[PDB]
Design a protein around this ligand. Structure first.
Ligand code: HEM
Ligand code: HEM
Ligand SMILES: *[C@@H]1O[C@H](CO)[C@@H](O)[C@H](O)[C@H]1NC(C)=O
Ligand SMILES: *[C@@H]1O[C@H](CO)[C@@H](O)[C@H](O)[C@H]1NC(C)=O
Ligand SMILES: *[C@@H]1O[C@H](CO)[C@@H](O)[C@H](O)[C@H]1NC(C)=O
Ligand SMILES: [Ca+2]
Ligand SMILES: [Ca+2]
Lengths: 254, 141, 321, 146
């Protein structure tokens, strides 16, 4: 069953996930002790970002290089072995990888995949929940899973906030941070909350989960790609899942 | 964050502090080394003790970099670009330590700036130092 | 025909704002790419609002909305209307809405300059009236060419021009101009180069000031060293006594002072006990002399008042003679 | 964690001079101004919108007075800190679900306020001792999330 958390909801921010409400969130740790996020999308597959998979590594690395160096946790502290990794054939515009597990994970109250959406929910103003294992205000990996509520931001406002102009040949890097996000038609942006909380180092790979009250179902509308959107820049940038749905179904079928 | 009011206030405080900046940087470093001894292992070739000429010099360098950043506060990624490259690639400084140093710098300012540490100016300086740390940790890998 | 209307929006009056053009009943804007003073002169002419004063991108008036009607205009400033300037065609542009041009004309601006809280009518804090309200200028980049332009505009003597605020309080309210950089030939301070109007980081502790003098009143003396050639360096400017701050005070500056009194060279910045010489509140700051100047007043960009030093102050000299 | 006698003497000798009715409100207010997400837990406190309003809010002052009272109680029981703080940990964790990072965060704000109030007397060794104390208190207070 997709998108039916047992306890539905009512990062340097707040909102500790105390009762457990995001059973699709996974915490991957690299060989050199960095924690990032990943999102269980069915009983055997998870979504993450290419950059997450390329940590600890040279800008030249393959799938068989990366696969044995990863460690992956679901639920609270249950280690799960990874079978393989499939990078998206593109990375200049999409920043996505799929992880395949050796065996099917048992589904329960604490571990359950999020459902993939059939509608485009990324309308301006919609408030989504981002859960993450990332760094807090002290830039230390958080001890407990947390989440924030963020609204989807205007794409053009975001483009202007990061790049000089929206016109391609007029663009110049204006990123308040060192690393530049990937911006194109496959991505959307999202502003922080109103008590000034946002995502930061290590949150990438997490799902922008939207709770559809009409069906009471949670949908992965985005996958956080640019996780440097700490309280210095304004918007995090996410890859639209609707724009990779076909590729996901295909990769799963094969 | 980093609103116009925050930028005005941080610039006011930095500019009044003026050339004492290096002394406060060195005091903040010493406070950090004594209070959070795990941070000492990034400086094995220094002699780490109160009054060290080497710590004084390094704190003066850090202060000068911060004054450069305040002087170029709207184009900070380029201004601090070289130091961010150095800190991520050569020194591999764990990002937590920038939060630790920034806190110790704030404590030093509080301890020496009685009037000039109102809640608004405290908040603006905290946000400024958090921004410097964010830029200097954005190239971690 | 008569189906073309233009207006300025959000600039607080009818003679200042972002350029909006109505065509076929829809309002739209113009990008600031290649936008210049000749275009602004045309616009200010269309509203009978007088001469152009400033042009700026979407920073002073905020971003517009809708179509960008014109881009890469080439027109000479004598055209009867902005839509009569040469253009690549309606709706052809490379600009974004961050490049929406805005203008302020003289009838919507209303500028005048005065000095306030001076020792004389030709010294004090410099205030500009804009749209009826008076405000100050921050001294970020404030130099001797700017002071010379200000002195010239007041009709004050320009032989010697100091920056800074003597007896002038800190201003309040708006800071209208920042990073003023004149060449000295401009007829008014608002025709020099400056940042965008109202966009600044300065605070009211930084206020530009001027002192305009013919040189006949500037006096320099050493007091309290037992002779006229040793002691604390006291200055009298417009009959106001003050002292030189030791920040930036070297042997070159001391040698300039020693030379002005005809005592040869400065031998020591040492301490000697003679008389009492009372303390004051007004300081002269020297940024640097070359040392070949004939007078301390010939050193560039010296600041008279406007800044407060720390405990270290009262530079003193003992010369040989 | 184990404080030596000179560090304990340093801490208690300074603490004897702290004004326990004001400093906790001062630290809580500064926490709310500098780290604004923490206002989520103080909805009943009314207007939390400007620095003057936070620092002047009498309920903020009163709650900070209670918080510092708890700090003082921990300072008097540096060896059995766990039992002293058991009920406060239950309160902050099981009912409010405040993230335990904020105990550390509040501690660092408190250190900054003490530095501002005591100036040169807040020497580097005294700061180090207070950092040890506040780290131990934060770790004790976060015990129920384990
Ligand atoms: C806001 C925080 C900081 C700033 C602005 C800063 C600034 C600087 C500057 C200006 C230099 C000298 C660069 C040069 O000489 O070209 C430097 C060097 C260095 N920094 Fe930092 N620093 C900060 C915090 C830290 C911390 C907390 C650590 C380690 C715990 C660290 C690790 C290093 C190392 C290892 C060096 C090399 C020293 C050398 O080459 O002499 N930095 N930093
Ligand atoms: C860091 C160490 C802290 C300690 C030792 C502490 C201690 C206390 C104390 C003594 C009380 C009063 C309990 C009573 O009167 O029965 C209290 C209540 C409370 N605490 Fe804290 N506090 C701390 C920090 C925080 C933080 C960081 C938050 C929120 C982020 C928080 C949220 C609250 C609230 C909202 C109450 C009042 C609840 C109510 O009145 O219903 N506290 N805590
Ligand atoms: C760091 O990595 C090493 C090597 O994998 C491991 O033994 C150690 O437990 C890790 N430490 C942390 C804090 O994760
Ligand atoms: C990868 O990029 C190529 C070139 O733009 C494009 O044709 C192809 O469709 C992309 N891959 C996928 C899976 O869409
Ligand atoms: C300085 O003091 C007052 C107030 O600014 C001013 O009127 C006066 O002219 C100045 N001093 C002298 C000696 O003229
Ligand atoms: Ca153009
Ligand atoms: Ca100038």
């Amino acid at each position: 069953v997709c998108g039916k958390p047992k306890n539905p909801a009512n990062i340097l921010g707040g909102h500790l996930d105390a009762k457990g409400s995001f059973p699709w969130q996974a915490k991957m740790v690299s060989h050199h002790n960095l924690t990032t996020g990943a999102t269980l999308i069915n009983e055997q597959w998870l979504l993450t970002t290419a950059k997450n998979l390329f940590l600890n590594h040279s800008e030249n690395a393959t799938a068989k290089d990366i696969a044995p160096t990863l460690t992956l946790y679901v639920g609270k502290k249950q280690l799960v072995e990874i079978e393989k990794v499939v990078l998206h054939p593109n990375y200049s515009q999409v920043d996505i990888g799929l992880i395949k597990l050796k065996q099917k994970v048992s589904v329960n109250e604490r571990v359950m995949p999020i459902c993939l959406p059939s509608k485009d929910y990324a309308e301006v103003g919609r408030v989504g929940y981002v859960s993450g294992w990332g760094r807090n205000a002290n830039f230390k990996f958080t001890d407990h899973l947390k989440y924030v509520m963020l609204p989807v931001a205007d794409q053009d406002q975001c483009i202007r906030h990061y790049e000089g102009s929206t016109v391609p040949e007029k663009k110049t890097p204006k990123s308040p941070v060192g690393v530049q996000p990937i911006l194109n038609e496959h991505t959307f942006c999202a502003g922080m909350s109103k008590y000034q909380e946002d995502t930061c180092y290590g949150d990438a790979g997490s799902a922008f989960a939207v709770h559809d009250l009409e069906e009471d179902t949670w949908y992965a509308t985005g996958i956080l790609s640019f996780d440097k959107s700490c309280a210095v820049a304004e918007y995090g940038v996410y890859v639209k899942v609707t724009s990779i749905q076909d590729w996901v179904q295909k990769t799963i079928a094969e | 964050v980093l609103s116009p009011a925050d930028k005005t206030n941080v610039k006011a405080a930095w500019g009044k502090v003026g050339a004492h900046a290096g002394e406060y940087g060195a005091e903040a470093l010493e406070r950090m080394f004594l209070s959070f001894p795990t941070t000492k292992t990034y400086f094995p070739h220094f002699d780490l003790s109160h009054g060290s000429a080497q710590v004084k010099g390094h704190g003066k360098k850090v202060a000068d970099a911060l004054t450069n950043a305040v002087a170029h506060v709207d184009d900070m990624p380029n201004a601090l670009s070289a130091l961010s490259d150095l800190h991520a690639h050569k020194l591999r400084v764990d990002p937590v330590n920038f939060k630790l140093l920034s806190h110790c710098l704030l404590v030093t300012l509080a301890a020496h700036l009685p009037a000039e540490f109102t809640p608004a100016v405290h908040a603006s300086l905290d946000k400024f130092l958090a921004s410097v740390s964010t830029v200097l940790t954005s190239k971690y890998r | 025909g008569s189906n073309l209307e233009m207006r300025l929006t959000r600039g607080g009056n009818m003679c200042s704002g972002r350029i909006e053009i109505k065509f076929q009943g829809r309002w739209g804007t113009v990008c600031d790419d290649n936008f210049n003073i000749d275009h602004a002169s045309v616009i200010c002419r269309q509203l009978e609002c007088g001469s152009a004063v400033s042009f700026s991108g979407s920073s002073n008036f905020g971003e517009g909305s809708g179509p960008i009607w014109f881009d890469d205009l080439i027109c000479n400033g004598n055209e009867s209307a902005l839509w009569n300037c040469k253009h690549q065609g309606w709706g052809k542009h490379n600009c974004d809405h961050a490049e929406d041009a805005g203008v302020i004309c003289s009838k919507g601006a209303d500028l005048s300059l005065r000095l306030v809280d001076g020792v004389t009518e030709c010294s004090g804090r410099l205030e500009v009236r804009f749209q009826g309200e008076w405000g100050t200028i921050c001294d970020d980049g404030w130099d001797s060419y700017d002071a010379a332009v200000a002195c010239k505009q007041l009709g004050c003597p320009t032989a010697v021009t100091a920056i800074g605020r003597v007896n002038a309080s800190k201003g309040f309210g708006h800071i209208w101009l920042d990073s003023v950089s004149c060449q000295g030939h401009e007829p008014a301070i608002w025709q020099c180069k400056h940042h965008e109007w109202g966009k600044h980081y300065c605070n009211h502790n930084e206020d530009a000031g001027v002192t305009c003098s013919d040189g006949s009143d500037l006096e320099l003396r050493l007091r309290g060293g037992g002779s006229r050639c040793a002691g604390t360096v006291e200055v009298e400017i417009q009959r106001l006594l003050g002292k030189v701050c030791d920040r930036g005070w070297g042997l070159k500056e001391a040698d300039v002072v020693c030379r002005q009194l005809g005592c040869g060279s400065a031998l020591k910045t040492s301490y000697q006990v003679y008389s009492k010489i009372q303390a004051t509140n007004t300081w002269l700051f020297l940024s640097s002399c070359n040392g070949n100047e004939t007078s301390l007043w010939d050193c560039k960009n010296w600041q008279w008042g406007g800044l407060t030093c720390d405990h270290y102050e009262e530079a003193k000299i003992t010369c040989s003679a | 964690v184990h404080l030596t006698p000179e560090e304990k003497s340093a801490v208690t000798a300074l603490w004897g001079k702290v004004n326990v009715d004001e400093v906790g409100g001062e630290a809580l207010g500064r926490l709310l101004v500098v780290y604004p997400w923490t206002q989520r837990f103080f909805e009943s406190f009314g207007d939390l919108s400007t620095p003057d309003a936070v620092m002047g809010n009498p309920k903020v002052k009163a709650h900070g007075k209670k918080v510092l009272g708890a700090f003082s109680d921990g300072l008097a029981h540096l060896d059995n800190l766990k039992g002293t703080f058991a009920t406060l940990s239950e309160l902050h964790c099981d009912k409010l679900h405040v993230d335990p990072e904020n105990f550390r965060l509040l501690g660092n704000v408190l250190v900054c306020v003490l530095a501002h109030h005591f100036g040169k007397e807040f020497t580097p060794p005294v700061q180090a001792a207070y950092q040890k104390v506040v780290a131990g208190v934060a770790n004790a207070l976060a015990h129920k999330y384990h």
